[PDB]
Amino acid sequence: TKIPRGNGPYSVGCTDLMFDHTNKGTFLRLYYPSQDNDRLDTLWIPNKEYFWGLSKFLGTHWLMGNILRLLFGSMTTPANWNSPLRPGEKYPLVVFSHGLGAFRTLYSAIGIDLASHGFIVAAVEHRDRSASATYYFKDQSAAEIGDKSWLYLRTLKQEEETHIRNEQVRQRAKECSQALSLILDIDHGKPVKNALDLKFDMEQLKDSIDREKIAVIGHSFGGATVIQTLSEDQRFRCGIALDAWMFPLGDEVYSRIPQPLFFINSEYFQYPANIIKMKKCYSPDKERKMITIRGSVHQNFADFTFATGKIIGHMLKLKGDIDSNVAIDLSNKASLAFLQKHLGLHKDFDQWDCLIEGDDENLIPGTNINTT
Numbered sequence: 001t002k003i004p005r006g007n008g009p010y011s012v013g014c015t016d017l018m019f020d021h022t023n024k025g026t027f028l029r030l031y032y033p034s035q036d037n038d039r040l041d042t043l044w045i046p047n048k049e050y051f052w053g054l055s056k057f058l059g060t061h062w063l064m065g066n067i068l069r070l071l072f073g074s075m076t077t078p079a080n081w082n083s084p085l086r087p088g089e090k091y092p093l094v095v096f097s098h099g100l101g102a103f104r105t106l107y108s109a110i111g112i113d114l115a116s117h118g119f120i121v122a123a124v125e126h127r128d129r130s131a132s133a134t135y136y137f138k139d140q141s142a143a144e145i146g147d148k149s150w151l152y153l154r155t156l157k158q159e160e161e162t163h164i165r166n167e168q169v170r171q172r173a174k175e176c177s178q179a180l181s182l183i184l185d186i187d188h189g190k191p192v193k194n195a196l197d198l199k200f201d202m203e204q205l206k207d208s209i210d211r212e213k214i215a216v217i218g219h220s221f222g223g224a225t226v227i228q229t230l231s232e233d234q235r236f237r238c239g240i241a242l243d244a245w246m247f248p249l250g251d252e253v254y255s256r257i258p259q260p261l262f263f264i265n266s267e268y269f270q271y272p273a274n275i276i277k278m279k280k281c282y283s284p285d286k287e288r289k290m291i292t293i294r295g296s297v298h299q300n301f302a303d304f305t306f307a308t309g310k311i312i313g314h315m316l317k318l319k320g321d322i323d324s325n326v327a328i329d330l331s332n333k334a335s336l337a338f339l340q341k342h343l344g345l346h347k348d349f350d351q352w353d354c355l356i357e358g359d360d361e362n363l364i365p366g367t368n369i370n371t372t
């Protein structure tokens with residue numbers, strides 16, 4: 001497959017954690033430094049109902065769903081599935097929020113890269129009906145049987161958009177906060193029964209978190225979720241909004257974010273009415289950075305950018321004029337530098353500090369949308 005391996009020194013493991021089993025419990029995919037590097041065998045889109053969900057999102061049918069499943073049902077992503085957690089160290093932790101029509105597995109290039117640099121990543125699956133699909137269990141016996149209840153994307157009427165997107169960003173923030181609590185709780189001995197029966201022993205996570213080093217990151221709906229989560233939850237020490245979609249946020253949020261905030265935008269997606277919300281977060285007393293990736297489209301941040309060929313990708317807008325690997329290294333490296341600065345890490349990420357300032361042939365400092 002063409003999802004890139006991570007560039008950092010650690011090998012990368014992957015597993016899923018759902019707790020509690022209910023529609024109100026937490027559901028996340030974890031990426032983490034693994035002890036060993038035995039095979040890059042993780043299944044990318046691990047269930048057929050995601051393809052039905054994804055098709056429902058693209059406004060098509062049962063047939064497109066079956067086509068996607070054929071194209072992608074067996075694609076892997078470069079992480080050792082259920083591999084042991086690399087011991088002897090406390091890792092900084094990232095909570096990741098997916099965009100509208102996505103789900104927890106679709107930003108593995110980001111997650112796997114961060115994990116190869118020593119982060120644990122918890123990519124959350126939202127149950128706000130913004131995911132194409134997701135699932136949960138109606139009772140503990142259903143979880144033992146693997147008897148999943150599915151939840152599919154809600155389509156909205158224009159008259160619903162403002163209220164519902166807002167309610168969803170609030171729930172989303174609460175899901176980020178709650179997923180954080182879950183990991184923090186396991187970090188500190190909380191016994192936990194994974195609703196999914198997986199080989200990875202969640203006890204490995206006991207005493208594995210550097211609890212002061214917590215960031216929230218997210219793409220597009222997930223960008224808005226970064227900002228909301230930051231405003232509510234001070235355990236998150238900084239934010240990185242990947243081509244945020246600002247529309248869901250209420251006016252109240254803007255004055256309420258003390259933590260450092262990084263906007264990494266695609267050249268081809270942004271518009272003034274959206275950029276203007278981003279500019280409202282700026283204040284001499286706060287740290288905000290913004291860079292724009294030259295030749296990039298919105299989809300450059302998610303994994304479908306790696307799923308097809310140049311020509312098809314370009315025509316479907318999964319790819320822009322920049323190389324997908326070039327784009328995702330620029331985003332990841334900038335991110336790593338930002339994390340090192342605002343989490344106080346003692347690594348070598350500050351070598352890409354100039355990428356925070358847009359100092360690359362493939363970056364614009366700030367935004368091409370010059371609206372002030």
Ligand SMILES: *P(=O)(OC(C)C)OC(C)C
Nearest residue numbers: 099100102220221222245
């Ligand atoms: P975001 O949540 O981006 C997805 C396409 C990944 O919102 C857009 C669709 C407006």
